[PDB]
Amino acid sequence: NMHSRVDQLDFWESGEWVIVDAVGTYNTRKYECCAEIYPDITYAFVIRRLPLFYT
Amino acid sequence: TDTEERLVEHLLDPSRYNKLIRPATNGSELVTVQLMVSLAQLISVHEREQIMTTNVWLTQEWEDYRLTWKPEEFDNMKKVRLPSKHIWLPDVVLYNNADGMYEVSFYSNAVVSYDGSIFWLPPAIYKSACKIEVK
């Protein structure tokens, strides 16, 4: 993991959603296909909707 | 002509011209790229998707000392057209594009002068994200 938090320096505010949290988690698991352990990084984007429009 | 093809082969000869190398004379020297956007048309502004589609001509000019020649040795030719895919290009792109297309849409020829000046004017249909104000 270069950095736990996902970089947002050049983010372009969509105007509909706001990123509450975005952290990549390093997971390792095995698949029934193959006999080796495969590592991965999963980024969980927690986005909160702005309700004014749909309200 | 024979002279023109001889010149073109001489300029783009891969043994003496590598398009992956910046045409920088000195280590601290940097290439200056002039830019100018010619708005040929404003195709549309989608407020729902917050995208503006424009048809622009992106004039780009810079100096490539490796593409110089003496006109007197080449039948007094002052400028030749070289394909833009076979010369070093400053990869200028629309950074805030809203559809994942960064480059230009045609990649036309580049008009090269005998002193190394490149003049490239490719067209492009750009889709840039916009902040639409609805108040």
Binding site: - | T1, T3, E4, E5, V8, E9, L12, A40, Q41, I43, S44, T53, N55, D75, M77, R81, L82, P83, H86, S105, F106, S108, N109, V111, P123, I125
Partner: protein, 159 residues
């Protein structure tokens, strides 16, 4: 087949596709441009675009691709990939949501006197101002602007 193999070996022995095909610099490559419409796919009034399916009929003279058919078992004409020869870079100026230049690149007919005939298909989504004053009885006037993109009049001229 061997005759055509020999002809192809000869023609592209020292051909340079990046150079304008004029024996003399002062000459003009005369390109006989012309369209043949296949179907008017759509006229998007809301978006002010016109989709068409046309064949672009370009014809020009190349002075390097010449031969005498007597030597090559009377091979007057051959079909060669269009990517191996110099072609005019005609583009659609008033493009909108499409491609500026032909992208299909069919095979170009080549004759024994240097002539070349290239007729690739293309779907052009040009822009055209729509007048809906008398809708649905309206009559539209949508235009396509074709021209060479980098060779001025002194070098390439459209006929």
């Amino acid at each position: 087949a061997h005759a055509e193999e020999r002809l192809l070996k000869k023609l592209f022995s020292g051909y340079n596709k990046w150079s304008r095909p004029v024996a003399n610099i002062s000459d003009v490559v005369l390109v006989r441009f012309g369209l043949s419409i296949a179907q008017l796919i759509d006229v998007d009034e809301k978006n002010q675009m016109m989709t068409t399916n046309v064949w672009v009929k370009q014809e020009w003279h190349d002075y390097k691709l010449r031969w005498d058919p007597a030597d090559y078992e009377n091979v007057t004409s051959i079909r060669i990939p269009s990517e191996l020869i110099w072609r005019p870079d005609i583009v659609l100026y008033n493009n909108a949501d499409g491609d500026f230049a032909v992208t299909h690149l069919t095979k170009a007919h080549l004759f024994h006197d240097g002539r070349v005939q290239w007729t690739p298909p293309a779907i052009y989504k040009s822009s055209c101002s729509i007048d809906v004053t008398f809708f649905p009885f309206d009559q539209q006037n949508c235009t396509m602007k074709f021209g060479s993109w980098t060779y001025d009049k002194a070098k390439i001229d459209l006929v």
